[PDB]
Amino acid sequence: KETAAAKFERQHMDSSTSAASSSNYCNQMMKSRNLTKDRCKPVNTFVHESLADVQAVCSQKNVACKNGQTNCYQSYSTMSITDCRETGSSKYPNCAYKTTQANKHIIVACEGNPYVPVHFDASV
């Protein structure tokens, strides 16, 4: 099965663009990363940074996850991110998202050897 690390990359990384280029970014990316296949994923964040820079967050500021887990880390630096959230008209299989550009710190949960992100917790 897909590893947690690999699912994080598929769901949350977009090193191929520096920011969202249009209001359709989320619609396109949510579809192409298979986040709308079985149901409309309600919210999702994409990070426009190199993979290594995001993986490095696992060695940055420890902070408890929203769910209380202690394997979460906040980036020292802000990152270019896109927030994707369903629009009021979204209705499977025609899933529809609002794209919002931002520069924020990210919080990720990490696991494994190599110790890498497995969950996107928050943008802050």
Which is nearest to 7 in space by CA: 115, 123, 116?
Answer: 116
62 is in an annotated binding site: no
Pick the catalytic residue: 8, 9, 11, 12? 12
Pick the catalytic residue: 47, 119, 120, 123? 119
Is 105 tagged catalytic? Answer: no
Is 119 tagged catalytic? Answer: yes
d(CA 2, CA 31): 18
Rounded CA Rg of the chain: 14
10 is in an annotated binding site: yes
41 is in an annotated binding site: yes
Active-site residue list: 12, 119
Annotated binding site for substrate: 7, 10, 41-45, 66, 85
